[PDB]
Symmetry: C3
Subunit: 369 residues, 3 copies
């Protein structure tokens, strides 16, 4: 008579959650650790660790409730504060809701990790803490609600499997604003290791977004492998033609470009589409960081490849191109408009909230160190 959780899905989603947490601790920390100067590594690792703990607490206190509760088109409710009224045996989809809480919580953590790790070098410890609380509550939570919580964008049929908008575009804009309001790689092997951990954990990230160990999770898994590989080759060959020599940083940057690009598309497109998305994202990323020259720059990779991925998702979702197919009565032209709407709303929403958070921190404690 009651809902039943699937233990295979339980097992899969719990492990995926650990993999996503792995992306932050120590994944994204080691990544930025090798990029920034050695004199700021220790301070950066501290901020990433402390803000990570902050997000975890805020998420269970009110974060999850406002993101996945009901709710309007933008915000949920406050009936799941400290996970109250959530039975231990409550089922969300085919898993226990508690697992759903932890999984989506790890998504919030890595999103914040992307921002903090890239500007911890330049932002006061007190300031970044203030920014996190504001931006998480007023940007990440409602955007996650719009796309995954049955909000505005979800009701328009937006296609974002693992968070092209919710995570990558959302954080890229927030980081770009911060880098603006305040404006050599120390250890490349450390960058490689961070990239490596990010890649491995990204499988929990992408395939876990299926919420079950099924054929869609399988599709997202293979598409993550293919797009990442195609983006590595796409970047380094573009780099080998441009500057006449491949680099380790270029190879790692290419991998991230593909992971970001396939993030909204992995569970919607075919393997052929994944290879195309990979190559394009790899080239678009390489074009992005060079055109930006005319870890502040990685927000160019996350931004561009995120936008590219969301757009190409609206194309290669079509059954004709090997995708899973658009919803009933939806054409490619209509879907692309919805993708563009999702991108536009996310950029505006994040930019405004980020600005407010940074400004608020600047007036209370100041941003400069």
């Amino acid at each position: 008579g009651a809902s039943v959780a699937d233990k295979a899905d339980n097992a899969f989603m719990m492990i995926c959650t650990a993999l996503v947490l792995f992306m932050t601790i120590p994944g994204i920390a080691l990544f930025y650790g090798g990029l920034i100067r050695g004199k700021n590594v220790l301070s950066m690792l501290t901020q990433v660790t402390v803000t990570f703990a902050l997000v975890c607490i805020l998420w269970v206190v009110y974060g999850y409730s406002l993101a996945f509760g009901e709710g309007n088109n933008f915000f949920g409710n406050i009936n799941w504060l400290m996970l109250k009224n959530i039975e231990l045996t409550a089922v969300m989809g085919s898993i226990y809701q508690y697992i759903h809480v932890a999984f989506q919580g790890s998504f919030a953590c890595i999103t914040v990790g992307l921002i903090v790790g890239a500007l911890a070098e330049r932002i006061r410890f007190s300031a970044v803490l203030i920014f996190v609380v504001v931006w998480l509550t007023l940007s990440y939570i409602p955007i996650a609600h719009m796309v995954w919580g049955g909000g505005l964008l979800a009701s328009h049929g937006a296609l974002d499997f693992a968070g092209g908008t919710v995570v990558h575009i959302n954080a890229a804009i927030a980081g770009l604003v911060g880098a603006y309001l305040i404006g050599k790689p120390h250890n490349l092997p450390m960058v490689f290791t961070g990239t490596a951990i990010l890649y491995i954990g990204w499988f929990g990230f992408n395939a876990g977004s299926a919420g079950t160990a099924n054929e869609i999770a399988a599709l997202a898994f293979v598409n993550t492998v293919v797009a990442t590989a195609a983006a590595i080759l796409g970047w380094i060959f573009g780099e080998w033609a441009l500057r006449g020599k491949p680099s380790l940083l270029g190879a790692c940057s290419g991998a991230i470009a593909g992971l970001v690009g396939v993030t909204p598309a992995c569970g919607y497109i075919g393997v052929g589409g994944a290879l195309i998305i990979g190559v394009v994202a790899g080239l678009a990323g390489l074009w992005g960081v060079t055109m930006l020259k005319r870890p502040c720059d990685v927000f160019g990779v996350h931004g561009v490849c995120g936008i590219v991925g969301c757009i190409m998702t609206g194309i290669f979702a079509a059954s004709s191109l090997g995708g899973v197919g658009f919803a009933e009565g939806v054409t490619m032209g209509h879907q692309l408009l919805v993708q563009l709407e999702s991108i536009a709303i996310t950029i505006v929403w994040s930019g405004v909230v980020a600005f407010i958070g940074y400004k608020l921190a600047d007036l209370t404690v100041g941003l400069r160190v």
Copy 2:
């Protein structure tokens, strides 16, 4: 007619086992590697690796049989030597017994890893090998039998989900004795990475102790996230008030304090209780290392937070506080006495056996390098 294993539980427990092994190799090794001097790192990594291999062999030869066989209140039997009389399709709980062997074996490995890694710098290679064999056989095995093998403490209704006594208190005392009989951080990023690996693997540690991918595993997972985060914040804010500035080492120490503290409680208490246990363990740990000043010190974190966690487990297990509830006919007052008994017996048992092991090594090969 015969017992059947659950493949979802099989899959989950095998992955959890790998995660616990991950805590030792290379988790705890990288952790102590960044703490101790650089001139002793190579020797320490060797001892940790060799003793790890030693425990693995001893465990399957007689370790598992004496720990989970039957048995009296303190020791099992010797009918499962080299896993003899254990059918390949034998089921322990809802998984194949072979998986149960490997999982509990990884618990023995990390427990020994906690000890060896912290005093490899000061103890002769020949001496630590002698100590491991003695202490594993006469301390870890019977204590594991008392709590998890249906021994003395288990029959009193002791609440220890993932090893507040069996692992943390047991090893802390053993390490404290050793540090007594023989009595600057080299790489903080290495400490952070070790802490990171320990944290990720700890999910297999805590949630895996449920023995199945169910709502209890889900509860332990979320409680591990919450308590760790609350302990990080608890430590650094206590540190920020005390010495006027947060540190990377403090953040990492806080994470370990919460992981240790929630270890016996994760599958018994509520999320609210987990946050409280986290904050308290974080503060108790910070108080511990400073009061100890008036990797020898980490045995203060493991000891104190382990004791604190076991005690607070007897409190927040109550249904009134959001816990899963005490056994039928058990009051909070009675449960706390059982918790205290478990702590007392473990401290005495470990201290005596550790002393004998160290003394025996001192008379045969000598402890000093």
Copy 3:
């Protein structure tokens, strides 16, 4: 009416796949990174990353089809190019075929990683790329087809659970030829970390080769723990007797020796046999690297222990020795001949194809840097 995938097996195999990918990124990269000179680390990491991406693409384009399609005794077909004609819900064994694609793809990646990482220091970037394409297509693919694709060796009843021939012997010969045609450890902690990651990922490697979370996967898991531990002890004690002192490199080398040795045997033999295989492989490996002195040398460990493991697999598979038992009508003498045939064919096949690949690269771009 149609075939159904098992979600527990789906979950298990997807996680195992991630663990095998973990062995390459960053596992094998960090391993060779600490071995070779510091001036070649960055270039080596780049080649490993780029060739990894190359294998991933080649595998889905035609690699999987030619390896597991049908097919003759040596090659499959080309009806699964870009995974065409493979329904998303298609089932291979008890999992979705897409998962089977990714899992076997990760095996191809780590095999190539073993080769590239060991001679990236000495081989031109353009040359190794040419070699990979040739060797993967004409050596790895048909050998994998012979053993796992229902080819020649599989029809003779060859026992190779996780790739004693397909991976280890195959790559060792290819690397040995390369080292011949072109013919101090930088960071031992980096070697240890690489060894650690390889070990953890190896559980997905060995236990995943069961294709399901069953008692055979459980057996392979425990045997991986036991053989690795026994080989660590076997190596260092042989080293402690020979040179009078154990080393970190020796401990790590021992671990790899056991992992390699138990690779073809893990799902076929008993725990007692695993301990024997471990000790023997550990000693055979130590003997190998010293006799080779009268990361070029690791191909001695992979070669010897691979051969030893394949042979001892034909012995300890017997029910009398605790194994799962030979096929109906197969004696130990007959099985050993089949093992020897598998080893002989693999060595010859790989050596010829490797030679052609290296020569072809030498005539087009040249091998020397």
